[PDB]
Amino acid sequence: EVETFAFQAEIAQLMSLIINTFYSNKEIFLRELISNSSDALDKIRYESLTDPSKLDSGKELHINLIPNKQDRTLTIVDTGIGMTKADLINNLGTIAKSGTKAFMEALQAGADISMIGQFGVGFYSAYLVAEKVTVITKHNDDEQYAWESSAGGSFTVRTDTGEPMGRGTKVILHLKEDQTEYLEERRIKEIVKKHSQFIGYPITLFVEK
């Protein structure tokens, strides 16, 4: 069964802004999603320091980037702490209501969109390039869930029956038709080297057939 939720008004406004503002430097979405994955990996690593059984669901801490030109999707996978159902409903584990307010005031005082991650809402930069985002996640303390939103004021949450993930988060970006450069190996490598050179986990870029 699928549950449908309305976004809080502030988040709907943030998403409408991201989608409708003219902003050419869209590549920053990948920097922000990788930073989120690195934070999620840090959290499970910290919890493992005092309870090593937290890693029973997978000892490898890494980030995988999976382009698929047939489906026009770019998937970002990490083996971080994952998100419970409550985390998903509460704006994917962010303080997005207060962060959105701070970000929109900053935009008034001479900030640009590339500063979004400094306000804790970098996930939503995915909508610079994606028409729909699917998030599949598994936290040690909960079941495997899928979150999805095309925007438009609502999101869905359902129990995921797909392949089990063990632990972590998969972000699936359904790219807009004019944003397919982010499926190209040379372009992804350029972005990772420019923005994510010092991330402290291995990043593997998968190849396509």
Side-chain angles (χ1 to χ4, degrees), residues 2-59 61-100 102-107 109-162 164-196 198-208:
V2 183
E3 296 176 296
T4 305
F5 300 83
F7 285 112
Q8 291 174 303
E10 289 85 356
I11 285 81
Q13 186 175 353
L14 174 78
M15 291 171 78
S16 189
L17 184 147
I18 289 170
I19 284 164
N20 300 116
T21 187
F22 184 83
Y23 182 76
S24 295
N25 186 32
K26 292 188 162 62
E27 71 187 34
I28 60 105
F29 81 92
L30 185 58
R31 172 188 77 196
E32 297 305 322
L33 295 177
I34 286 169
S35 178
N36 286 359
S37 292
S38 172
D39 290 352
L41 288 158
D42 286 352
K43 289 181 193 144
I44 189 70
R45 183 180 262 161
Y46 185 74
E47 287 193 5
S48 76
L49 296 181
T50 64
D51 184 1
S53 75
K54 302 287 181 103
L55 296 181
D56 281 352
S57 43
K59 274 142 154 253
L61 304 177
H62 57 44
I63 303 168
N64 295 330
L65 307 176
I66 309 174
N68 180 342
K69 283 185 213 7
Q70 210 93 63
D71 295 348
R72 211 166 71 206
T73 56
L74 177 65
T75 300
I76 297 95
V77 183
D78 66 69
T79 51
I81 194 157
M83 262 180 305
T84 65
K85 194 184 186 190
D87 289 324
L88 286 179
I89 294 167
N90 276 274
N91 299 307
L92 301 100
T94 69
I95 48 163
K97 190 198 145 203
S98 68
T100 292
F103 180 50
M104 268 165 174
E105 294 196 320
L107 292 181
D112 83 301
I113 288 169
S114 70
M115 290 185 63
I116 186 165
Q118 274 153 45
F119 304 97
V121 287
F123 168 80
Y124 299 93
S125 67
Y127 290 93
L128 291 170
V129 298
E131 64 193 16
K132 182 173 64 173
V133 177
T134 306
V135 174
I136 294 167
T137 191
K138 175 67 169 81
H139 187 283
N140 282 335
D141 286 350
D142 215 331
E143 283 229 278
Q144 187 164 308
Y145 294 99
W147 176 106
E148 190 161 274
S149 181
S150 306
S154 64
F155 63 94
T156 59
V157 174
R158 57 177 100 211
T159 279
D160 184 57
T161 167
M165 305 170 55
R167 187 198 59 249
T169 298
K170 174 186 297 199
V171 178
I172 303 164
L173 312 169
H174 305 262
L175 297 177
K176 302 167 181 163
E177 292 176 349
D178 62 332
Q179 303 296 327
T180 53
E181 71 189 85
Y182 301 108
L183 301 164
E184 290 298 322
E185 181 170 348
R186 232 169 1 173
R187 183 66 170 116
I188 296 165
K189 294 183 176 287
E190 178 185 47
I191 299 166
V192 169
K193 285 168 176 313
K194 183 177 179 181
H195 296 288
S196 306
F198 299 125
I199 290 287
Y201 301 97
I203 299 168
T204 299
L205 174 56
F206 284 31
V207 188
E208 285 195 75

mmCIF file of all heavy atoms in Angstrom, residues 15-58:
data_model
loop_
_atom_site.group_PDB
_atom_site.id
_atom_site.type_symbol
_atom_site.label_atom_id
_atom_site.label_comp_id
_atom_site.label_asym_id
_atom_site.label_seq_id
_atom_site.Cartn_x
_atom_site.Cartn_y
_atom_site.Cartn_z
ATOM 1 N N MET A 15 10.829 23.885 -3.469
ATOM 2 C CA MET A 15 10.909 23.080 -4.669
ATOM 3 C C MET A 15 10.457 23.865 -5.895
ATOM 4 O O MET A 15 11.059 23.735 -6.968
ATOM 5 C CB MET A 15 10.082 21.806 -4.489
ATOM 6 C CG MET A 15 10.732 20.879 -3.477
ATOM 7 S SD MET A 15 9.660 19.464 -3.044
ATOM 8 C CE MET A 15 9.887 18.427 -4.468
ATOM 9 N N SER A 16 9.408 24.673 -5.766
ATOM 10 C CA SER A 16 8.945 25.473 -6.896
ATOM 11 C C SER A 16 10.014 26.469 -7.332
ATOM 12 O O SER A 16 10.203 26.711 -8.526
ATOM 13 C CB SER A 16 7.643 26.183 -6.534
ATOM 14 O OG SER A 16 7.078 26.786 -7.685
ATOM 15 N N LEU A 17 10.738 27.035 -6.371
ATOM 16 C CA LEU A 17 11.827 27.955 -6.686
ATOM 17 C C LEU A 17 12.941 27.267 -7.457
ATOM 18 O O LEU A 17 13.456 27.800 -8.448
ATOM 19 C CB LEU A 17 12.379 28.546 -5.398
ATOM 20 C CG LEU A 17 13.467 29.590 -5.620
ATOM 21 C CD1 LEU A 17 13.368 30.630 -4.527
ATOM 22 C CD2 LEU A 17 14.852 28.974 -5.661
ATOM 23 N N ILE A 18 13.367 26.105 -6.976
ATOM 24 C CA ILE A 18 14.444 25.348 -7.621
ATOM 25 C C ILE A 18 14.056 25.012 -9.046
ATOM 26 O O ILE A 18 14.882 25.075 -9.974
ATOM 27 C CB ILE A 18 14.764 24.093 -6.789
ATOM 28 C CG1 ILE A 18 15.472 24.547 -5.504
ATOM 29 C CG2 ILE A 18 15.549 23.078 -7.611
ATOM 30 C CD1 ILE A 18 15.666 23.504 -4.445
ATOM 31 N N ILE A 19 12.796 24.642 -9.240
ATOM 32 C CA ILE A 19 12.374 24.179 -10.548
ATOM 33 C C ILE A 19 12.219 25.315 -11.531
ATOM 34 O O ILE A 19 12.424 25.132 -12.731
ATOM 35 C CB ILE A 19 11.066 23.386 -10.395
ATOM 36 C CG1 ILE A 19 11.363 22.009 -9.826
ATOM 37 C CG2 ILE A 19 10.378 23.296 -11.745
ATOM 38 C CD1 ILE A 19 10.125 21.334 -9.292
ATOM 39 N N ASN A 20 11.824 26.508 -11.075
ATOM 40 C CA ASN A 20 11.442 27.550 -12.007
ATOM 41 C C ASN A 20 12.479 28.659 -12.162
ATOM 42 O O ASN A 20 12.362 29.455 -13.099
ATOM 43 C CB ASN A 20 10.083 28.118 -11.614
ATOM 44 C CG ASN A 20 8.966 27.058 -11.627
ATOM 45 O OD1 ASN A 20 8.368 26.740 -10.601
ATOM 46 N ND2 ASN A 20 8.750 26.458 -12.792
ATOM 47 N N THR A 21 13.494 28.716 -11.306
ATOM 48 C CA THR A 21 14.499 29.766 -11.391
ATOM 49 C C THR A 21 15.504 29.461 -12.497
ATOM 50 O O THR A 21 15.891 28.312 -12.709
ATOM 51 C CB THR A 21 15.222 29.924 -10.051
ATOM 52 O OG1 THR A 21 16.098 31.059 -10.100
ATOM 53 C CG2 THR A 21 16.039 28.686 -9.725
ATOM 54 N N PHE A 22 15.906 30.510 -13.219
ATOM 55 C CA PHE A 22 16.939 30.367 -14.228
ATOM 56 C C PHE A 22 18.285 30.319 -13.525
ATOM 57 O O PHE A 22 18.674 31.285 -12.846
ATOM 58 C CB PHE A 22 16.887 31.531 -15.224
ATOM 59 C CG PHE A 22 17.872 31.386 -16.359
ATOM 60 C CD1 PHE A 22 17.568 30.621 -17.473
ATOM 61 C CD2 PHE A 22 19.103 32.022 -16.303
ATOM 62 C CE1 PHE A 22 18.478 30.488 -18.514
ATOM 63 C CE2 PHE A 22 20.015 31.897 -17.338
ATOM 64 C CZ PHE A 22 19.706 31.128 -18.445
ATOM 65 N N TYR A 23 18.994 29.215 -13.683
ATOM 66 C CA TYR A 23 20.256 29.018 -12.979
ATOM 67 C C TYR A 23 21.034 27.988 -13.777
ATOM 68 O O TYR A 23 20.629 26.830 -13.859
ATOM 69 C CB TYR A 23 19.999 28.555 -11.527
ATOM 70 C CG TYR A 23 21.288 28.390 -10.750
ATOM 71 C CD1 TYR A 23 21.949 29.526 -10.290
ATOM 72 C CD2 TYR A 23 21.845 27.148 -10.483
ATOM 73 C CE1 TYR A 23 23.138 29.427 -9.607
ATOM 74 C CE2 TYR A 23 23.055 27.038 -9.770
ATOM 75 C CZ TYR A 23 23.678 28.201 -9.333
ATOM 76 O OH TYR A 23 24.865 28.179 -8.638
ATOM 77 N N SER A 24 22.156 28.410 -14.373
ATOM 78 C CA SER A 24 22.834 27.529 -15.330
ATOM 79 C C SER A 24 23.784 26.547 -14.674
ATOM 80 O O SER A 24 24.089 25.523 -15.286
ATOM 81 C CB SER A 24 23.585 28.401 -16.340
ATOM 82 O OG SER A 24 22.678 29.171 -17.126
ATOM 83 N N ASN A 25 24.222 26.806 -13.446
ATOM 84 C CA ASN A 25 25.263 25.997 -12.778
ATOM 85 C C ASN A 25 24.647 24.792 -12.064
ATOM 86 O O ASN A 25 24.817 24.596 -10.856
ATOM 87 C CB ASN A 25 25.997 26.894 -11.782
ATOM 88 C CG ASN A 25 27.189 26.230 -11.121
ATOM 89 O OD1 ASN A 25 27.865 25.396 -11.712
ATOM 90 N ND2 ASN A 25 27.417 26.579 -9.861
ATOM 91 N N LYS A 26 23.949 23.949 -12.832
ATOM 92 C CA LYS A 26 23.138 22.885 -12.260
ATOM 93 C C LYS A 26 23.983 21.732 -11.706
ATOM 94 O O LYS A 26 23.460 20.953 -10.895
ATOM 95 C CB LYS A 26 22.167 22.362 -13.319
ATOM 96 C CG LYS A 26 21.091 23.383 -13.717
ATOM 97 C CD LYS A 26 20.044 22.743 -14.612
ATOM 98 C CE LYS A 26 18.761 23.553 -14.678
ATOM 99 N NZ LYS A 26 19.072 24.878 -15.275
ATOM 100 N N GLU A 27 25.258 21.638 -12.107
ATOM 101 C CA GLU A 27 26.091 20.498 -11.727
ATOM 102 C C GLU A 27 26.237 20.390 -10.228
ATOM 103 O O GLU A 27 26.637 19.320 -9.735
ATOM 104 C CB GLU A 27 27.488 20.607 -12.356
ATOM 105 C CG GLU A 27 28.369 21.689 -11.778
ATOM 106 C CD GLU A 27 29.673 21.885 -12.542
ATOM 107 O OE1 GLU A 27 29.698 21.718 -13.780
ATOM 108 O OE2 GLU A 27 30.671 22.228 -11.881
ATOM 109 N N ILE A 28 25.940 21.475 -9.493
ATOM 110 C CA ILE A 28 26.117 21.392 -8.045
ATOM 111 C C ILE A 28 25.197 20.363 -7.384
ATOM 112 O O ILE A 28 25.471 19.953 -6.240
ATOM 113 C CB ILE A 28 25.941 22.760 -7.356
ATOM 114 C CG1 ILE A 28 24.553 23.323 -7.612
ATOM 115 C CG2 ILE A 28 26.993 23.770 -7.819
ATOM 116 C CD1 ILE A 28 23.658 23.217 -6.449
ATOM 117 N N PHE A 29 24.139 19.876 -8.062
ATOM 118 C CA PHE A 29 23.274 18.853 -7.441
ATOM 119 C C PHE A 29 24.125 17.642 -7.042
ATOM 120 O O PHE A 29 23.894 17.010 -6.006
ATOM 121 C CB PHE A 29 22.124 18.426 -8.394
ATOM 122 C CG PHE A 29 22.552 17.430 -9.420
ATOM 123 C CD1 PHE A 29 22.433 16.057 -9.178
ATOM 124 C CD2 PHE A 29 23.121 17.832 -10.613
ATOM 125 C CE1 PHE A 29 22.908 15.131 -10.082
ATOM 126 C CE2 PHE A 29 23.597 16.905 -11.533
ATOM 127 C CZ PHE A 29 23.466 15.543 -11.279
ATOM 128 N N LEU A 30 25.142 17.292 -7.852
ATOM 129 C CA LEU A 30 25.854 16.053 -7.584
ATOM 130 C C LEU A 30 26.783 16.230 -6.393
ATOM 131 O O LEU A 30 26.913 15.325 -5.558
ATOM 132 C CB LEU A 30 26.617 15.616 -8.829
ATOM 133 C CG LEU A 30 27.326 14.271 -8.740
ATOM 134 C CD1 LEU A 30 26.361 13.170 -8.434
ATOM 135 C CD2 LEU A 30 28.074 14.003 -10.037
ATOM 136 N N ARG A 31 27.379 17.404 -6.264
ATOM 137 C CA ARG A 31 28.170 17.739 -5.080
ATOM 138 C C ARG A 31 27.331 17.618 -3.809
ATOM 139 O O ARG A 31 27.766 17.034 -2.808
ATOM 140 C CB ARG A 31 28.738 19.152 -5.209
ATOM 141 C CG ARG A 31 29.400 19.655 -3.949
ATOM 142 C CD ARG A 31 29.779 21.135 -4.083
ATOM 143 N NE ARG A 31 28.607 21.987 -3.933
ATOM 144 C CZ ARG A 31 28.549 23.262 -4.299
ATOM 145 N NH1 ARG A 31 29.577 23.867 -4.863
ATOM 146 N NH2 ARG A 31 27.421 23.943 -4.094
ATOM 147 N N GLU A 32 26.108 18.136 -3.838
ATOM 148 C CA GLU A 32 25.298 18.130 -2.642
ATOM 149 C C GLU A 32 24.847 16.721 -2.273
ATOM 150 O O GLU A 32 24.780 16.386 -1.082
ATOM 151 C CB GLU A 32 24.072 19.016 -2.838
ATOM 152 C CG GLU A 32 24.366 20.454 -3.071
ATOM 153 C CD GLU A 32 25.219 21.066 -1.977
ATOM 154 O OE1 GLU A 32 25.006 20.704 -0.812
ATOM 155 O OE2 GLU A 32 26.081 21.894 -2.294
ATOM 156 N N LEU A 33 24.460 15.895 -3.264
ATOM 157 C CA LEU A 33 24.051 14.523 -2.949
ATOM 158 C C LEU A 33 25.223 13.699 -2.424
ATOM 159 O O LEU A 33 25.057 12.859 -1.522
ATOM 160 C CB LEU A 33 23.419 13.843 -4.157
ATOM 161 C CG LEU A 33 22.107 14.529 -4.567
ATOM 162 C CD1 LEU A 33 21.559 13.856 -5.820
ATOM 163 C CD2 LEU A 33 21.064 14.446 -3.440
ATOM 164 N N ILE A 34 26.432 13.873 -2.995
ATOM 165 C CA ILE A 34 27.597 13.160 -2.490
ATOM 166 C C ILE A 34 27.929 13.625 -1.073
ATOM 167 O O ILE A 34 28.307 12.820 -0.218
ATOM 168 C CB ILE A 34 28.771 13.325 -3.458
ATOM 169 C CG1 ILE A 34 28.529 12.470 -4.713
ATOM 170 C CG2 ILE A 34 30.113 12.946 -2.789
ATOM 171 C CD1 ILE A 34 29.505 12.797 -5.818
ATOM 172 N N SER A 35 27.785 14.914 -0.785
ATOM 173 C CA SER A 35 28.037 15.386 0.579
ATOM 174 C C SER A 35 27.047 14.763 1.554
ATOM 175 O O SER A 35 27.425 14.338 2.661
ATOM 176 C CB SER A 35 27.967 16.920 0.596
ATOM 177 O OG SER A 35 28.153 17.464 1.887
ATOM 178 N N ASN A 36 25.774 14.670 1.167
ATOM 179 C CA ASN A 36 24.801 13.997 2.000
ATOM 180 C C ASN A 36 25.177 12.536 2.255
ATOM 181 O O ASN A 36 25.033 12.038 3.383
ATOM 182 C CB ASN A 36 23.419 14.035 1.341
ATOM 183 C CG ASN A 36 22.752 15.391 1.406
ATOM 184 O OD1 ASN A 36 23.255 16.350 1.948
ATOM 185 N ND2 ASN A 36 21.594 15.451 0.792
ATOM 186 N N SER A 37 25.616 11.824 1.212
ATOM 187 C CA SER A 37 26.043 10.440 1.386
ATOM 188 C C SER A 37 27.231 10.341 2.332
ATOM 189 O O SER A 37 27.250 9.461 3.241
ATOM 190 C CB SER A 37 26.392 9.811 0.029
ATOM 191 O OG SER A 37 25.253 9.650 -0.798
ATOM 192 N N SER A 38 28.185 11.258 2.197
ATOM 193 C CA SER A 38 29.344 11.232 3.096
ATOM 194 C C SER A 38 28.905 11.447 4.558
ATOM 195 O O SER A 38 29.389 10.741 5.458
ATOM 196 C CB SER A 38 30.359 12.279 2.633
ATOM 197 O OG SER A 38 31.436 12.425 3.571
ATOM 198 N N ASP A 39 27.961 12.372 4.811
ATOM 199 C CA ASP A 39 27.441 12.581 6.157
ATOM 200 C C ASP A 39 26.744 11.332 6.709
ATOM 201 O O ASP A 39 26.915 10.989 7.893
ATOM 202 C CB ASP A 39 26.447 13.753 6.179
ATOM 203 C CG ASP A 39 27.092 15.120 5.979
ATOM 204 O OD1 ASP A 39 28.319 15.243 5.967
ATOM 205 O OD2 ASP A 39 26.311 16.067 5.748
ATOM 206 N N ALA A 40 25.983 10.639 5.864
ATOM 207 C CA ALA A 40 25.316 9.398 6.261
ATOM 208 C C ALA A 40 26.310 8.290 6.585
ATOM 209 O O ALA A 40 26.103 7.497 7.527
ATOM 210 C CB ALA A 40 24.356 8.965 5.147
ATOM 211 N N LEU A 41 27.415 8.222 5.836
ATOM 212 C CA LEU A 41 28.473 7.252 6.130
ATOM 213 C C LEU A 41 29.181 7.592 7.422
ATOM 214 O O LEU A 41 29.462 6.715 8.229
ATOM 215 C CB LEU A 41 29.452 7.217 4.953
ATOM 216 C CG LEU A 41 28.816 6.538 3.734
ATOM 217 C CD1 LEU A 41 29.533 6.958 2.465
ATOM 218 C CD2 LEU A 41 28.832 5.032 3.874
ATOM 219 N N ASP A 42 29.445 8.886 7.651
ATOM 220 C CA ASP A 42 30.050 9.286 8.912
ATOM 221 C C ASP A 42 29.191 8.840 10.083
ATOM 222 O O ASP A 42 29.707 8.471 11.149
ATOM 223 C CB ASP A 42 30.208 10.805 8.976
ATOM 224 C CG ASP A 42 31.316 11.370 8.104
ATOM 225 O OD1 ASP A 42 32.128 10.661 7.514
ATOM 226 O OD2 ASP A 42 31.375 12.615 8.061
ATOM 227 N N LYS A 43 27.858 8.953 9.941
ATOM 228 C CA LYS A 43 26.998 8.632 11.090
ATOM 229 C C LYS A 43 27.050 7.154 11.449
ATOM 230 O O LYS A 43 27.107 6.799 12.630
ATOM 231 C CB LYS A 43 25.563 9.053 10.801
ATOM 232 C CG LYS A 43 25.336 10.541 10.794
ATOM 233 C CD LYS A 43 23.864 10.891 10.516
ATOM 234 C CE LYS A 43 23.678 12.387 10.179
ATOM 235 N NZ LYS A 43 22.615 12.594 9.130
ATOM 236 N N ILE A 44 27.005 6.272 10.446
ATOM 237 C CA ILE A 44 27.068 4.849 10.822
ATOM 238 C C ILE A 44 28.464 4.488 11.298
ATOM 239 O O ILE A 44 28.610 3.658 12.214
ATOM 240 C CB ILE A 44 26.579 3.959 9.672
ATOM 241 C CG1 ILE A 44 26.448 2.518 10.167
ATOM 242 C CG2 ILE A 44 27.479 4.047 8.482
ATOM 243 C CD1 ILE A 44 25.312 2.338 11.123
ATOM 244 N N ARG A 45 29.510 5.108 10.737
ATOM 245 C CA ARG A 45 30.853 4.854 11.256
ATOM 246 C C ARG A 45 30.958 5.268 12.723
ATOM 247 O O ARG A 45 31.506 4.525 13.551
ATOM 248 C CB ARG A 45 31.888 5.592 10.417
ATOM 249 C CG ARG A 45 33.318 5.301 10.866
ATOM 250 C CD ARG A 45 34.273 6.053 10.011
ATOM 251 N NE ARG A 45 34.818 5.208 8.959
ATOM 252 C CZ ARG A 45 35.388 5.694 7.866
ATOM 253 N NH1 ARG A 45 35.453 6.998 7.656
ATOM 254 N NH2 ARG A 45 35.897 4.858 6.965
ATOM 255 N N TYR A 46 30.400 6.440 13.080
ATOM 256 C CA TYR A 46 30.472 6.871 14.479
ATOM 257 C C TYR A 46 29.702 5.904 15.387
ATOM 258 O O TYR A 46 30.175 5.539 16.467
ATOM 259 C CB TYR A 46 29.934 8.316 14.616
ATOM 260 C CG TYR A 46 30.126 8.804 16.032
ATOM 261 C CD1 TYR A 46 31.354 9.147 16.505
ATOM 262 C CD2 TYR A 46 29.039 8.822 16.912
ATOM 263 C CE1 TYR A 46 31.552 9.538 17.840
ATOM 264 C CE2 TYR A 46 29.225 9.202 18.239
ATOM 265 C CZ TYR A 46 30.452 9.565 18.693
ATOM 266 O OH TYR A 46 30.559 9.938 20.017
ATOM 267 N N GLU A 47 28.513 5.485 14.957
ATOM 268 C CA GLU A 47 27.753 4.556 15.800
ATOM 269 C C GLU A 47 28.487 3.237 15.946
ATOM 270 O O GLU A 47 28.422 2.619 17.009
ATOM 271 C CB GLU A 47 26.347 4.305 15.237
ATOM 272 C CG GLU A 47 25.376 5.473 15.412
ATOM 273 C CD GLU A 47 23.912 5.098 15.148
ATOM 274 O OE1 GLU A 47 23.614 3.907 14.913
ATOM 275 O OE2 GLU A 47 23.052 6.004 15.193
ATOM 276 N N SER A 48 29.194 2.798 14.908
ATOM 277 C CA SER A 48 29.915 1.526 15.011
ATOM 278 C C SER A 48 31.057 1.588 16.005
ATOM 279 O O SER A 48 31.553 0.531 16.437
ATOM 280 C CB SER A 48 30.445 1.085 13.642
ATOM 281 O OG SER A 48 31.594 1.807 13.219
ATOM 282 N N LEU A 49 31.535 2.781 16.364
ATOM 283 C CA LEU A 49 32.713 2.829 17.225
ATOM 284 C C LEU A 49 32.419 2.198 18.572
ATOM 285 O O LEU A 49 33.320 1.627 19.206
ATOM 286 C CB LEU A 49 33.185 4.262 17.432
ATOM 287 C CG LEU A 49 33.661 4.996 16.196
ATOM 288 C CD1 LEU A 49 34.135 6.414 16.559
ATOM 289 C CD2 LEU A 49 34.768 4.248 15.477
ATOM 290 N N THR A 50 31.191 2.335 19.051
ATOM 291 C CA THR A 50 30.795 1.779 20.344
ATOM 292 C C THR A 50 29.891 0.560 20.235
ATOM 293 O O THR A 50 29.687 -0.114 21.238
ATOM 294 C CB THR A 50 30.096 2.853 21.207
ATOM 295 O OG1 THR A 50 28.879 3.281 20.582
ATOM 296 C CG2 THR A 50 31.023 4.043 21.526
ATOM 297 N N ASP A 51 29.334 0.267 19.061
ATOM 298 C CA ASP A 51 28.497 -0.917 18.858
ATOM 299 C C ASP A 51 28.833 -1.483 17.485
ATOM 300 O O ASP A 51 28.191 -1.141 16.484
ATOM 301 C CB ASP A 51 27.016 -0.586 18.973
ATOM 302 C CG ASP A 51 26.129 -1.815 18.865
ATOM 303 O OD1 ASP A 51 26.672 -2.930 18.709
ATOM 304 O OD2 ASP A 51 24.890 -1.648 18.885
ATOM 305 N N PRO A 52 29.851 -2.340 17.398
ATOM 306 C CA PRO A 52 30.271 -2.847 16.081
ATOM 307 C C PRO A 52 29.201 -3.660 15.393
ATOM 308 O O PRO A 52 29.277 -3.828 14.167
ATOM 309 C CB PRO A 52 31.511 -3.694 16.393
ATOM 310 C CG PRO A 52 31.972 -3.204 17.700
ATOM 311 C CD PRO A 52 30.738 -2.826 18.466
ATOM 312 N N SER A 53 28.190 -4.128 16.128
ATOM 313 C CA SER A 53 27.119 -4.887 15.500
ATOM 314 C C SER A 53 26.277 -4.020 14.583
ATOM 315 O O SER A 53 25.475 -4.547 13.810
ATOM 316 C CB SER A 53 26.224 -5.540 16.560
ATOM 317 O OG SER A 53 25.366 -4.606 17.180
ATOM 318 N N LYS A 54 26.449 -2.698 14.649
ATOM 319 C CA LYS A 54 25.727 -1.837 13.716
ATOM 320 C C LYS A 54 26.140 -2.116 12.279
ATOM 321 O O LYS A 54 25.434 -1.732 11.350
ATOM 322 C CB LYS A 54 25.989 -0.358 14.006
ATOM 323 C CG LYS A 54 25.634 0.099 15.401
ATOM 324 C CD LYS A 54 24.136 0.189 15.558
ATOM 325 C CE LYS A 54 23.700 0.668 16.931
ATOM 326 N NZ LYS A 54 23.263 2.090 16.961
ATOM 327 N N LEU A 55 27.324 -2.690 12.080
ATOM 328 C CA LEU A 55 27.812 -2.972 10.738
ATOM 329 C C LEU A 55 27.499 -4.403 10.302
ATOM 330 O O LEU A 55 27.970 -4.824 9.245
ATOM 331 C CB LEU A 55 29.313 -2.686 10.654
ATOM 332 C CG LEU A 55 29.765 -1.226 10.854
ATOM 333 C CD1 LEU A 55 31.298 -1.092 10.709
ATOM 334 C CD2 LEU A 55 29.030 -0.313 9.879
ATOM 335 N N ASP A 56 26.698 -5.119 11.077
ATOM 336 C CA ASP A 56 26.288 -6.464 10.663
ATOM 337 C C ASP A 56 25.544 -6.437 9.335
ATOM 338 O O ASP A 56 25.577 -7.409 8.580
ATOM 339 C CB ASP A 56 25.421 -7.101 11.748
ATOM 340 C CG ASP A 56 26.239 -7.646 12.904
ATOM 341 O OD1 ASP A 56 27.484 -7.670 12.815
ATOM 342 O OD2 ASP A 56 25.642 -8.064 13.908
ATOM 343 N N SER A 57 24.888 -5.314 9.016
ATOM 344 C CA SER A 57 24.132 -5.160 7.790
ATOM 345 C C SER A 57 25.008 -4.742 6.601
ATOM 346 O O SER A 57 24.481 -4.398 5.535
ATOM 347 C CB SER A 57 23.035 -4.108 8.000
ATOM 348 O OG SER A 57 23.580 -3.002 8.722
ATOM 349 N N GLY A 58 26.327 -4.722 6.773
ATOM 350 C CA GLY A 58 27.226 -4.369 5.691
ATOM 351 C C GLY A 58 28.438 -3.613 6.190
ATOM 352 O O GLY A 58 28.288 -2.526 6.747
#
